[PDB]
Design a protein around this ligand. Sequence first.
Ligand SMILES: C=CC1=C(C)/C(=C/c2[nH]c(/C=C3N=C(/C=C4\NC(=O)C(C)=C4C=C)C(C)=C\3CCC(=O)O)c(CCC(=O)O)c2C)NC1=O
Length: 166
Amino acid sequence: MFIKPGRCPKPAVQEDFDAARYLGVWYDIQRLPNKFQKGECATATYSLSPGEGFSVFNRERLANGTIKSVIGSAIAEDPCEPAKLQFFHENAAPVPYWVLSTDYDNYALVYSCINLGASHAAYASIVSRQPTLPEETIKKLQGTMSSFGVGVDTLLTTNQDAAYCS
Ligand SMILES: C=CC1=C(C)/C(=C/c2[nH]c(/C=C3N=C(/C=C4\NC(=O)C(C)=C4C=C)C(C)=C\3CCC(=O)O)c(CCC(=O)O)c2C)NC1=O
């Protein structure tokens, strides 16, 4: 279903966010169950764009062994708030992409809440520069998540095993 009652929180974001340090490959460690991501081995690649934002290439492996991917764009509508991006894909309405925390080199926590009148749709990933992330880092980030109405108990652990994902 993925539609949940109540409207979105406005969590705090990475205040000093440098999109240039955020570029390259990020691996999905944990994610909320959502509509689009039906697979495993989920990676996001962020690329140089002429403009203010960056180009997005998201990639996953489905249960039948097929690779499915999407291209989009992430751009901060307010350069006072550079961690509040909007994600543009296809014909779609932009969805928020909020970097709540990153050290650029190890981890990020990303959130997107879509308001649907009285209900909402939430995306939340813990990502890593590696296919794994220390259980301490995941605990801290899960801690941030619980503080704005995400249930850590809903989080999928993403399969990043080279034997399936190669
Ligand atoms: C928390 C933020 C977050 C947002 C804003 C989000 C949105 C989002 N992810 C999508 C696809 C996707 N999203 C991902 C992966 C990712 N997406 C990411 O933002 C990140 C960090 C990864 C993983 C590292 C994948 C693999 C797809 C393709 C799904 C498919 O087509 O099978 C789509 C397009 C749907 C489509 O056309 O199929 C949207 C709008 N998902 C998220 O996780």
